[PDB]
Design a protein around this ligand. Sequence first.
Ligand SMILES: O=P(O)(O)O[C@H]1[C@@H](OP(=O)(O)O)[C@@H](OP(=O)(O)O)[C@@H](OP(=O)(O)O)[C@@H](OP(=O)(O)O)[C@H]1OP(=O)(O)O
Lengths: 1366, 150, 414
Amino acid sequence: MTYIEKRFPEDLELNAQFLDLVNYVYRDETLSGSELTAKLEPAFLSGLRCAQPLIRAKFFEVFDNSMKRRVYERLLYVTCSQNWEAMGNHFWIKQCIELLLAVCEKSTPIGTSCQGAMLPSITNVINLADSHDRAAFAMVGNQLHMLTNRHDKFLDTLREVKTGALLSAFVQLCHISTTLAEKTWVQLFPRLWKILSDRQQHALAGEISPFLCSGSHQVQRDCQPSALNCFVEAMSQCVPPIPIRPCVLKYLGKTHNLWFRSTLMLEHQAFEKPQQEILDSLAELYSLLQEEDMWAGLWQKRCKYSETATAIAYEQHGFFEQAQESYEKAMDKAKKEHERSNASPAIFPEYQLWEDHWIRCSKELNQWEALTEYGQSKGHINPYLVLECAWRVSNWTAMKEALVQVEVSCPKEMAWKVNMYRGYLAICHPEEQQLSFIERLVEMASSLAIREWRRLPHVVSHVHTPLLQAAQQIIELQEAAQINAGLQPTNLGRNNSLHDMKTVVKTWRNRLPIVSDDLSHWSSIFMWRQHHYQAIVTAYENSSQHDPSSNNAMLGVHASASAIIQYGKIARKQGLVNVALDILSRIHTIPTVPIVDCFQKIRQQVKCYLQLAGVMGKNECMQGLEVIESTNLKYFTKEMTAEFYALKGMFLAQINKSEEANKAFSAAVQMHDVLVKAWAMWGDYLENIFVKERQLHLGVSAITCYLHACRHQNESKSRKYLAKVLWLLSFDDDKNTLADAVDKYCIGVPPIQWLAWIPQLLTCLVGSEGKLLLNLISQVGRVYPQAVYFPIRTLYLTLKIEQRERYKSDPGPIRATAPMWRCSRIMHMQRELHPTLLSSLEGIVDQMVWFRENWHEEVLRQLQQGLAKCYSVAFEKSGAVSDAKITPHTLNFVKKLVSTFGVGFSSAASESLARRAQATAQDPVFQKLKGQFTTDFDFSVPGSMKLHNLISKLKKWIKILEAKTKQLPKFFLIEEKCRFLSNFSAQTAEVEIPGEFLMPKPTHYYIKIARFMPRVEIVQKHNTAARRLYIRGHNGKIYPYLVMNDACLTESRREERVLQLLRLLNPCLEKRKETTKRHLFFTVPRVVAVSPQMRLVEDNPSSLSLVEIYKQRCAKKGIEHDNPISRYYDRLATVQARGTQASHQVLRDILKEVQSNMVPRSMLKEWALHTFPNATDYWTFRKMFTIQLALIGFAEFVLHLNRLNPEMLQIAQDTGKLNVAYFRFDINDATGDLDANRPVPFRLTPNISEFLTTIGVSGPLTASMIAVARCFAQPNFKVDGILKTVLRDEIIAWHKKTQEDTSGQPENMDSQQLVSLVQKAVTAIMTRLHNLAQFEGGESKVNTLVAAANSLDNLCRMDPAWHPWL
Amino acid sequence: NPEWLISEDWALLQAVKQLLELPLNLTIVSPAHTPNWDLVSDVVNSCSRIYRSSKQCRNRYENVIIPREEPLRTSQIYAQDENATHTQLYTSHFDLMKMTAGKRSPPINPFQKNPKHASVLAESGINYDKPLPPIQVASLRAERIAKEKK
Amino acid sequence: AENEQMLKPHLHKIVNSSMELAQTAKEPYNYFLLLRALFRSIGGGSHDLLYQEFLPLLPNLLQGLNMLQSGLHKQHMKDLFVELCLTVPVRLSSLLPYLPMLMDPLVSALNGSQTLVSQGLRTLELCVDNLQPDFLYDHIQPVRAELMQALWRTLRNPADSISHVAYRVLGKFGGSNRKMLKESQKLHYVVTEVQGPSITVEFSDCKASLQLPMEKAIETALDCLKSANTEPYYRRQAWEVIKCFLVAMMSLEDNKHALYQLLAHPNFTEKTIPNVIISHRYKAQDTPARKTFEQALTGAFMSAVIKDLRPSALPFVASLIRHYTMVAVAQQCGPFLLPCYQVGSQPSTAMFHSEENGSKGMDPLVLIDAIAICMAYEEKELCKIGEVALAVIFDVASIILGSKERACQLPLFS
Ligand SMILES: O=P(O)(O)O[C@H]1[C@@H](OP(=O)(O)O)[C@@H](OP(=O)(O)O)[C@@H](OP(=O)(O)O)[C@@H](OP(=O)(O)O)[C@H]1OP(=O)(O)O
């Protein structure tokens, strides 16, 4: 049994012979021998799990007869009496399936209980319909008789099949496939639990936990589908499985691949409320998952001492020094309380938290000497901390003793850490230089790291960051191996080793971690590199003969200086100035250093002084200026002096002098005219002084500065400067001075930089400064024809449509306006330049016109918008009367709708479509429908003018139409009408996918449309039957798009502007810590307006909305989704029936009743639980939902956007990304300013909070909100400029709309009113952003904001159409 | 290794007792409930002091517990003998060392417009006292580019 | 030294000929083998003579190979394409302006077989070692989610060396190995709440019964019956599972005399057939039951092709096709007409089994979907069983209806 299978696994003959031998020993002569069976258990198990079917069958036939044929007995056996340790990395649960399915009855006919999916028999048509029809049918050649006889014989042959033939083959199939057999156990075990009585279930659940532990049943620890994973999944998937210990849950989660399932179970226990062990284990497991936000929220819920909450809040947002101070204060207060009297043992976890987090903070603050002095305490030596913090200070003896003390008691998870420390010791020990076992240590460390990786979840997340970081240091140790192999005197000075050393140093210089990583890893990398840099330096000091040029030592010196400077730069970026000054004092203690890197050190110093000069004091800032002036500039270059003077001018403009700063900026720009940053800052100062003093001779200078700064640089950086440039155009005078200024110095700037601002310069295209801007947009368009063709196409068509309404009195054609001719001459020039591409685009646009589908969904969308407006206006009349009359505008809308009811370039496609519409309009069905509707939609009768009567009639007709429209095609072939699209090919034109030129990409790999897919589906989204178009590229991937008919040219153009704003803000989120660390990013689909009435938007197939999920759950329950609003309004009416205007308590009780009756808060939670059965998928989905919801809430609050209605929020099931339906600034139509002051700042309805389980809110949600608030609050990003640029055109459109009602001279609003209004509007957003960014005392207003977002005292006052319950 | 605290010792004893097995012989009827030494190790090292829970210690200290459990019992020494004073004194010593380490850590208008920074610029050939407007600077840059092109 | 002069003049010729001919060939496999052999020969050693003549061939050759490997092709063809397009005998110094065309096949090689993932990791290490990290990052920026996901999946590969080199290249990437992925990872989810088909199992010891879902079981059966690596007895067990699933999911309540009296009526051969049109354009999304039925039917049709399963699969398949077509013609013809097949009816969802009302019983038209997916199968030997199914359908339809031209007016044929 021991050796035959180990040494001869391939020779299955002798293995089968030995298995037959043991099977005979077990089968025959049992009455004589029964003690021999004890030792041969592994042999029996191996023969049972063998790959041969006959051996498995003959082993199972004897394994089954040894037990009673009762499900409970076999379950107890497999759960407490059978030891699977001898199995060995096997999925033994398939043997449990064997045993549980073999005991089933297999002597009865086969059948199924799925009556809904039953297939009708041949004679089933004899009983379905009425009686007499079949009774008369029952009283009514050979080629058919033979067929019938053969069919009856075959059916008789089928009726002989028993259930026993199915289960055996099912088990034999589950044998070979480990996947889709784990699922069978997961899905069958709870079915068994369902039939077990209470007496059996109690004992089974009480004894399962010992079996969940089962001691040595740990060989599955490295099994990918570990048996314990499947067993605990199945156990948890039961209905009554209450008793399970949280400690065993955490142990299974850590050891086995049960991380997220274990966390979900523990939190489900925690949120049900001696009992602190649950929360303790949950916090430990969260800290083990690297999920800082959930751990912080849980502890803030558990925090007893107020100091702990502040310390956790500080450490959560990168405030490490204040976090350490707060932890010190907390443990000092705790020491005082202990000196007063003893505390309960439940406080020990808080003390361990303080200990480990103070250790972590001191580690992040570059306190390695203090950490070494602490861990080396005589009484409580902490060997792990010493081993961690010893090599970074060259304490190699302490490191060696700590290693030999840890190697005997190191956690198996830190095996690769111990290997790396052993390598560090062997490489850097003075008296133990033994470079014999180096590559072996690296190989063992990599193997251990990969083994640990195999133990982590399959979806990569923060849990995997430690190993992804360890990989870099491991490969660096591998490189350090050859570095040291080349530095020995045998190879010292050899060119072959010198080249390798140079290459490795260059790679290290060019290989850097990311800012998202903590400073601890940056230090672990840079200090490790510094040892070898110094070795290179020192190695070239005793070999003056080798390489006698003083270059290779200078190489190491420069490498070390650059590494120090980079570490200081990273520490500064993260918000640490004290450590920066410490590093600068460190680098100062060197005999001599290069001159090139000393300039960079001074640059970092002046940058630290800059970012510290927000509230600079007189003494400190003057001392910094003196230190700046003290630097020598003798042996330095020229460009360095330019940068130095630029930084000087910046630092001195920070203070309110403004004269010497201007002089220094001018001198720096004259010193090096190519220096982009100097000229950009000069232009910033010039813009400031221009906005203040309002001198015309300064605006031209500011614009020239901005343009020269934008000339020679990358577009990502130059974006915020083009933003500043575009905003300055609102200050021009009648002479158009700055217009000619910008038109004179625009030759030279790259044309790609204007792609991100085409809409901003298009709005100026209609101003008095036209011709020059037309020339500029045409010049930039000569390189990007489509990016300039689509927007001008849309704007030209919108202008024509507007003029059509302006000339209602004149029939026939009319003369074009100035902007119209201006923007059409450029289109003519483009067609002259790019005829083929523009012709292909025109063809595409003319073919997609066939997507004007029909009158059915047209009138459906019309009445949907009507009902929406009716509810929106009724909410206004709710508290006053609620028996209100329809408004004149809504009356006119409904009248026009019921009157037209759907039927309302020298091209021929439009004419053919109109002909087809007139043709299909000759059927009697739609005529009868129109008649029935007109006989009801008339308002000239009494009692029908009431608003709620109209709402009820609209709901009736909505039900009728939705029942009618449920019989229509769901997809059509593109070749049916769109010939040019089906015939489209890459050979026709190199046209790119729409929405590609919007954001410029570094590379030019733009996926071209290879061909349009034949199928075009119809999806019900946005309360309309949109047409989904699929486009394929040359890469094989498919992109779906919705050809949306806007039917409102103003709202769509105002909607797709916040999308551009968010897309402009997205880069910024990715350039800071605490934002990339949390993966914060806006999900902004691509939207391109191809015409005033139609626009093409990108989407994905699996994207539901909150209202979609709500109505799905309702249909599952069998109720109407319009019930809660109707109930709210009915309560309102019945309360007002006695003259009492509904008070606050009325709304509160209405909300409570509608939530407890037909809208439970656990609807979204159960929907998500059912949708994502996998624990890892569910956790990832919930985390993505939390972060995206927090981001969009911050957006809609700081940015005065319209209320996030439930139907707007799109929820991607495939990734969890949350995107809304086209937000838009809620600018007051009357006053023209942002007034987003609703009772609720952002949507956090009870259902959402329930889905976020009330800790995702207190943690990741508020954490992400605070992070994104502090992120945009940074002045370096200048988000105020982008906000001003967007609000400029947001308010110009408002003024245009407000002036159109009364009635070139009116083409311009004003020279002072527009700027004043834009400044008033942008400050309203900036103040709200700063209020959220404030993080004084570890506290933020975001907590009060999220608390008010879900308070019932304010939710009850929200619009019923807003669904404060969903 | 550091000494074992009575608190973590009673925790280990309870974890072994919660494995549903007796110390008389650690494989009781229902032999599938073998002793999970790694589980009790994980449950123990979550106590006050350092991990100190390798493959050896877990067995060694349980074998030490067995004799003195078959003097005061571990449960009695836990409930008795200043129940929470030992771990609390350990943590107070830890906090005192923390404060000592944090305390000994280091804490961490002469206007001079010297003529060197202005003399270098004067040598470069640009006037500093007279600020050249950006327009003239742009014209000079254009003239320099033209000269370079020729 | 001597033979490079006779191959250089024909290099461009053979390359272009094989590239333009395999596009419109009958078996474009030997040409790609020849291309791979040519690339191996040119890469072997430092010729430095054919290199100059091969340089101007990358602009079109790389584009063609990318377009080929991007399209849908058989597994071996795709493997050959991705392996011959990655192993180009051209140094990285000259492949700079044509490097972007190597990421799409690289991400597929990383997801391919052991040889393919090894070749992909080899090329990845070659390009990360012989190029600056910044430019390589800007190069992979368009496709980072797929590449990183494949590098993380291959890390769990059973091969020790493969996972080791994957970890090594991940460490070589540096901090970029964990940058935020805008194209977030996809995760599985269920789209419907209705339970799929199941088999009823009973227990006499406790006087109870259970329901055994069999969706994933049928999926496993079909998967192991499609692949060629599975053993014969496992194929037989999967065929048995599929057969019991098919026979268990029908009524089996037909009598001889009743069937004869039902099929022997003058209306079947005299009454006009309603000329309604069946179209999947109105068919809703496939319910779990319908997709499981399609999987079982295609698995049975495949077993009918399997040599050792044919003797028992072919007759059962023929008889089941007879049953399906007979129930179809009985429900859509004769004196008994369904409310959706009467005169004047229009296409609607009543003809298909869907989550909504749909039909009253299971839709027998699913048999056509099985034949369709079988004939469209990657292997062409399945088309034979589809033709046999159509033949038996037409034959039994003409038998039950007579006047063959009359049996073609059935919406089943539409
Ligand atoms: O990386 P540093 O040297 O510390 O400075 C950078 C740098 O700008 P400069 O190098 O010109 O100072 C960045 O751009 P890259 O050069 O890395 O492309 C970027 O500046 P941009 O905003 O212009 O991209 C960033 O700034 P931020 O923090 O706003 O991302 C930051 O400048 P800081 O000195 O403000 O860190």
